[PDB]
Design a protein around this ligand. Structure first.
Ligand SMILES: O[C@@H]1CCN(c2ncnc3[nH]ccc23)C1
Length: 167
């Protein structure tokens, strides 16, 4: 039993809700919140910009030190950093950005990072400003993640479409 509330159950392990991931994280304080990161951990917009703003830029400060030490992530890769005031940990995961011409097959690799964590709050990878089809992202999520994932879909209109089209 966990403290996530109001989710629709899609499969044995995937749950979905129309919600703002920032406000959800602040309420639940999950062990792991997933960020929709880029390889440089430049949290400008989308989910990343919103999470960083909620940390008063502490996420960006920590991220800049991470990059200075380690260099960029790989597309499809991830790193674990602090969750600041939002969660114990933040798993920064880089899904392909279609608006940069990145390979969509890497979306499965991106979701595989979730399997290293027993429970996560997460967005649909590569959705929103990353330019992928959210229905496809949800399909890859369900077919790749085996751990317990609580998906927050910000757009209510998008949430309703995701539920009604789910196979
Ligand atoms: O890529 C799409 C576009 C934005 N996005 C989000 N998902 C869940 N919570 C969020 N809060 C702020 C943005 C956001 C997914």
């Amino acid at each position: 039993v966990n403290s996530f509330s109001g989710y629709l159950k899609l499969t044995d392990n995937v749950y979905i809700k129309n919600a703002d991931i920032v406000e959800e994280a602040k309420k639940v304080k999950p062990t792991v919140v997933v960020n929709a990161a880029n390889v440089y951990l430049k949290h400008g917009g989308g989910v990343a910009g919103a999470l960083n703003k909620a940390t008063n830029n502490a996420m960006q400060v920590e991220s800049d030190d991470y990059i200075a030490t380690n260099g960029p992530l790989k597309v499809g890769g991830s790193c674990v950093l602090s969750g600041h005031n939002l969660a114990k940990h933040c798993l920064h995961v880089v899904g392909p950005n279609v608006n940069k011409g990145e390979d969509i097959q890497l979306l499965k690799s991106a979701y595989e990072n979730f399997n290293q964590h027993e429970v996560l709050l997460a967005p649909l990878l590569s959705a929103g400003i990353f330019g992928a089809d959210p229905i496809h992202s949800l399909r890859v999520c369900v077919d790749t993640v085996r751990t317990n994932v609580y998906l927050a879909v910000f757009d209510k209109n998008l949430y309703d479409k995701l539920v009604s089209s789910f196979l």
